[PDB]
Design a protein around this ligand. Structure first.
Ligand code: MG
Ligand code: MG
Ligand code: ZN
Lengths: 127, 78, 98, 60, 155, 24, 117
RNA sequence: AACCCCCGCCGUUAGUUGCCAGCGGUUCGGCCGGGCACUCUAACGGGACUGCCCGCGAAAGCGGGAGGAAGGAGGGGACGACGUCUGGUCAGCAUGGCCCUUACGGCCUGGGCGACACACGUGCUACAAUGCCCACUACAAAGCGAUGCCACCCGGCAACGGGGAGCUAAUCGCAAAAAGGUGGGCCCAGUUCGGAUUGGGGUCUGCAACCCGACCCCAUGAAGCCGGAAUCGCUAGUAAUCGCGGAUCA
């Protein structure tokens, strides 16, 4: 019945409980268009829905926690992907080449000692 | 700031009380530049130390709310 | 009903003592929730290497203080004697309460 | 004044604002961690030796 | 690097129109890592475009960046111990880079108060054939044909 | 102004609260 | 209108207008409006004649201000001067009262940099 | 190089963290029952080996692609050889020699490392409309706390004080992450930009805040409208930028 998938990025997890229906999307309560306001990445998270050709035909319910505001969006992005692919093996043959199934290894690194920001070193000098 | 009970040393008040108890001189080599000047103590001369020596700084009406250190140099040429 | 705390450093020694209790309590009494690991509180200490001036190449350690929880329900007399005699702790300061 | 000072640090005759921290091992005046009660120097020395329980090499 | 050429950074295509060139422009506008801010600021001008002229902001953007695309430029180079101002064709990427860049600066040059209106008016003059960024382009191309003598060292 | 001794982020940078910054 | 005796903060926010008044600032500006029921948004260019004398006379007679305030500031300094407290001698040479970094900057009171070397 | 630690894909093991994902009740707070699937909490193991397909080659290897969470060391850490610099440190400590011994040792009060006509280094805060103020609203991680972290209530404009619950603490607490987001004021001004300097009054620590602490509220509102010669940082979650914690310690 339902389409589940796990979302995660920058320690921002996001459960994805999808249920075929209309288009009403709830995430941690509230509404999708309600929670994300004035952000273009919002409609970008629904990209997997536009790839499958079924924008308005599914009621979503995501539980995203931790991480930043945007990290949640990327979490929902990959989360929705695993949800729709869970009940669709052929949709992986067109969601994968488009690049979706990846935790995005890109993550902040440790601020190294002696330095200031893991890389930026204090102004070199000799005077 | 010490708003609850103005700060000051006991031997300061003690030594200065006998000075008012009969109206003696004023000579008094102190070592507590941290204390606050007592009001009725006007007209006396506290020899305040400052690492170097005892400064014969006089006293009056205006100089009261301030410390004893306020009127005693701790550095040369100042 | 009863709850046991198993604080300690080395998780290798903590795993042996924790698993030991699990076998002893279950194999000789009612139900017992397995070893429940908690967020390990760590004391990260950073510091300089050289004695004099060297605000770089500094070295730092960390104090691993592990935590493991185990809950026994029905107070069995067999489990009380088992844990009272058959025990092999060491660097594992345990604390138990009702 | 090194010896007489390490003794004065444990004295605490007058007010508490003189019972400053003082390393036990090599008796350092500063860089004294309260937890270990040692200085940063003698701290690392022991750590390498393994005389510091639970104190493993930090790496992440 | 001395070894590899280092491949370009394939950026994410536009999230509203569907075009990488647009998003790249947002990045140039992006101050202190505020994409969503710069994005809106860009789309603000897009609406200002339709306010003035009934033209789509999409092609209005292409026309501008196209007319500010430097065809050639002079580059310094040593020869035995002397620098020659040798002109020659630019790389398509760099042309796109400079174009998008100059426009952003040309907007800053304007007296306009709000950033959007600055980007708005600038995109108009750019698409037209005469603007702050455009003239800076015309300037560079002059240097090329000017030093055309030293163009013998094409390298 | 991260330096204004009388603003929002004014006390925030100074790790304090006071009047202009809400406090319990 | 000539509010504080001579000062005339015309054509602008009423609250800000009082900020230009010596001895009056952002805080004391809001206080006058909350004690006379004046909207901070409205300009001085369009106010009632009653409100003029109203707000003007209020702040005027209420607390100290203007040069007479500035006279008190120097007055206390005459007191730190007549004897010479550590605070006063700093005003003598122009040094800061906080005993800050004189070995470096502190140009705010020491004036421009007199290189000379 | 490779074995060990952190972050990435997944599983096994343990379910008082979280969970109407499933159902019912519900003062609708996962609160009750209930459940371990999920998230997570750590613990063990798996996976990536130019392994597979195609081109080049004698080989090693290189190049393009599929599978895959991740390809040609995946990102990061720890690891810094023989030697080098008469490099640093007798003031961490050890230590040969040297020198003093009613003082080159020891205790105390006060002063002093904070002294300023000047110059250099590393920094912080700005010069503002991609911006500044007010009100309202939302998403972190990591770490720390029983004579310590203080929920929350009363008071004061305020720092903060009086009362007082929880907490040897994934269960209580510092705690509001900030930037962002919504609506509003500002209209280019030495400015609601900028916050140095200075006057008056207050709170906390501490025997004790003149020298010489910190933070409040009122006023004061200086230079600077992006900086000469020259010069520094970093190739991706990096630069820039915006926050929180910890050691230290009254
Ligand atoms: Mg798992
Ligand atoms: Mg006043
Ligand atoms: Zn020591």
């Amino acid at each position: 019945e339902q389409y589940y998938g796990t979302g995660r990025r920058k320690e921002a997890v996001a459960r994805v409980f999808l249920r075929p229906g209309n288009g009403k999307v709830t995430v941690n309560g509230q509404d999708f268009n309600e929670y994300f306001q004035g952000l273009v990445r919002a409609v970008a998270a629904l990209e997997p829905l536009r790839a499958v050709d079924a924008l308005g035909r599914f009621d979503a319910y995501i539980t995203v926690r931790g991480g930043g505001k945007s990290g949640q969006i990327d979490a929902i992005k990959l989360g929705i992907a695993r949800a729709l692919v869970q009940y669709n093996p052929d949709y992986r043959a067109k969601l994968k080449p488009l690049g979706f199934l990846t935790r995005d290894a890109r993550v902040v690194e440790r601020k190294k000692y002696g330095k200031h920001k893991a890389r930026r070193a204090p102004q070199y000098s000799k005077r | 700031s010490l708003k609850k009970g103005v700060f000051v040393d006991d031997h300061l008040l003690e030594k200065v009380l006998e000075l008012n108890a009969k109206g003696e001189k004023r000579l008094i080599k102190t070592w507590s530049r941290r204390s606050t000047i007592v009001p009725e103590m006007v007209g006396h001369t506290i020899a305040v130390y400052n690492g170097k020596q005892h400064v014969p700084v006089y006293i009056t009406e205006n100089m009261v709310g301030h410390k004893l250190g306020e009127f005693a140099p701790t550095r040369t040429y100042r | 009903k009863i709850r046991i705390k198993l604080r300690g450093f080395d998780h290798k020694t903590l795993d042996a003592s924790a698993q030991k209790i699990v076998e002893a309590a279950r194999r000789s009494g009612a139900q017992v929730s397995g070893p429940i690991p908690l967020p390990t509180r760590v004391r990260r200490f950073t510091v300089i290497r050289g004695p004099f001036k060297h605000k770089d190449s500094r070295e730092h350690f960390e104090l691993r203080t592990h935590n493991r929880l185990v809950d026994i329900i029905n107070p069995n007399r067999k489990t009380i004697e088992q844990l009272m005699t058959l025990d092999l702790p060491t660097g594992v300061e345990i604390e138990i309460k009702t | 004044a090194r010896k007489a000072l390490i003794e004065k640090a444990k004295r605490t005759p007058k007010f508490k604002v003189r019972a400053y921290t003082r390393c036990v091992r090599c008796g350092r005046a500063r860089s004294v961690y309260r937890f270990f009660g040692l200085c940063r120097i003698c701290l690392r020395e022991l750590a390498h030796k393994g005389q510091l329980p639970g104190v493993r090499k930090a790496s992440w | 690097a001395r070894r590899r050429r280092a491949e370009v950074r394939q950026l994410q295509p536009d999230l509203v129109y569907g075009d990488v060139l647009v998003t790249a422009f947002i990045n140039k506008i992006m101050r202190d890592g505020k994409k969503n801010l710069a994005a809106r600021i860009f789309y603000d001008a897009c609406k200002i475009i339709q306010e003035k002229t009934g033209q789509e902001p999409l092609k209005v953007f292409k026309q501008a960046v196209e007319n500010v695309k430097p065809r050639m430029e002079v580059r310094s180079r040593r020869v035995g111990g002397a620098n020659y101002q040798v002109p020659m064709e630019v790389s398509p990427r760099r042309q796109q880079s400079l174009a998008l860049r100059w426009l952003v600066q040309a907007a800053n040059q304007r007296p306009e108060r709000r950033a959007a209106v600055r980007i708005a008016h600038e995109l108009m003059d750019a698409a037209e054939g005469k603007g702050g960024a455009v003239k800076k382009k015309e300037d560079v191309e002059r240097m090329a044909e000017a030093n055309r003598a030293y163009a013998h060292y094409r390298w | 102004g991260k330096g204004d001794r009388r603003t929002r982020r004014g006390k925030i940078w100074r790790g304090t609260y006071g009047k202009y910054r809400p406090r319990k | 209108a000539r509010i504080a005796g001579v000062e005339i903060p015309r054509n602008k926010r009423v609250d800000v207008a009082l900020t230009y008044i010596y001895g009056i600032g952002k805080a004391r500006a809001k206080e006058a409006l909350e004690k006379t029921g004046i909207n901070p948004a409205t300009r001085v260019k369009d106010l009632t004649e009653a409100e003029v004398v109203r707000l003007r006379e209020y702040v005027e007679n209420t607390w100290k201000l203007e040069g007479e305030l500035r006279a008190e500031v120097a007055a206390n300094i005459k007191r730190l001067m007549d004897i010479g407290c550590y605070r006063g001698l700093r005003h003598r040479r122009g040094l800061p009262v906080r005993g800050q970094r004189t070995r470096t900057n502190a140009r705010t009171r020491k004036g421009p940099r007199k290189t000379v070397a």
